[PDB]
Amino acid sequence: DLWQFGQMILKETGKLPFPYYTTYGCYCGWGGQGQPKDATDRCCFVHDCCYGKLTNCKPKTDRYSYSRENGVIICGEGTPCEKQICECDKAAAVCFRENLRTYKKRYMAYPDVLCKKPAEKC
Amino acid sequence: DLWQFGQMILKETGKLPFPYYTTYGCYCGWGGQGQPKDATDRCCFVHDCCYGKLTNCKPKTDRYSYSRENGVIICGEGTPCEKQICECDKAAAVCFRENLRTYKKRYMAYPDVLCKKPAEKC
Ligand SMILES: [Ca+2]
Numbered sequence: 001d002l003w004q005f006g007q008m009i010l011k012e013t014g015k016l017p018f019p020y021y022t023t024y025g026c027y028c029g030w031g032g033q034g035q036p037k038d039a040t041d042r043c044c045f046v047h048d049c050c051y052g053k054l055t056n057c058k059p060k061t062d063r064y065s066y067s068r069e070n071g072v073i074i075c076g077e078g079t080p081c082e083k084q085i086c087e088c089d090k091a092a093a094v095c096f097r098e099n100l101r102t103y104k105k106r107y108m109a110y111p112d113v114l115c116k117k118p119a120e121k122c
Numbered sequence: 123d124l125w126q127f128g129q130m131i132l133k134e135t136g137k138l139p140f141p142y143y144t145t146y147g148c149y150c151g152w153g154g155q156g157q158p159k160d161a162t163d164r165c166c167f168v169h170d171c172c173y174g175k176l177t178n179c180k181p182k183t184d185r186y187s188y189s190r191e192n193g194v195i196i197c198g199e200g201t202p203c204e205k206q207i208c209e210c211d212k213a214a215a216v217c218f219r220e221n222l223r224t225y226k227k228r229y230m231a232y233p234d235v236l237c238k239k240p241a242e243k244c
Pocket residue numbers: 038039040041099100102103104
């Protein structure tokens with residue numbers, strides 16, 4: 001579920017989702033309505049894509065099993081939906097971490113007015 | 123700033139902003155575009171209002187001083203903007219807490235499609 005996604009983001013990035021991810025840029029922080037401005041910003045678009053492929057799942061509310069004991073997110077047992085949701089969430093939290101180097105504090109609470117309409121597709 | 127707002131929300135509600143507040147309902151979780159669905163949901167609308175009154179401030183990025191030593195948020199010294207931002211943030215975190223009793227888990231990630239256009243005004 002979203003609370004597990006939150007915890008993954010924290011564990012991978014050492015940052016809490018709010019305000020660092022939830023308000024970032026034109027896609028994370030504008031609810032999906034603008035073209036991703038940078039890589040961090042696209043991570044959310046990819047995550048939205050990975051959720052869209054799960055037509056038979058409830059990725060926001062289904063609770064999966066994962067372990068992070070040894071520094072690595074390990075997706076555990078559960079239903080096929082739960083596993084697939086977990087993998088969407090892991091992959092996004094990893095993407096945020098891999099892209100800390102280009103993370104810009106300026107894109108936080110970025111004014112929506114400057115956001116362009118969506119262009120990439122899943 | 124938003125990170126301080128985040129910490130106030132956590133301290134008052136015992137919940138992290140994401141996903142409990144950032145995705146709630148039609149105003150908190152839909153970036154301000156729908157009519158608040160309930161009281162928790164209006165708290166965000168009031169907070170948006172309190173920020174709007176601060177035409178001469180940067181409420182998202184200005185860092186104020188507050189203390190929560192004794193269970194109560196005490197807004198400290200700083201510029202008049204910093205004080206006023208702090209009071210906006212305190213008042214919203216208190217509103218969320220006062221309204222935990224009517225908090226509905228269903229409004230988390232509420233489908234935007236069912237959201238009505240804004241009606242109340244600041
Ligand atoms: Ca980036």
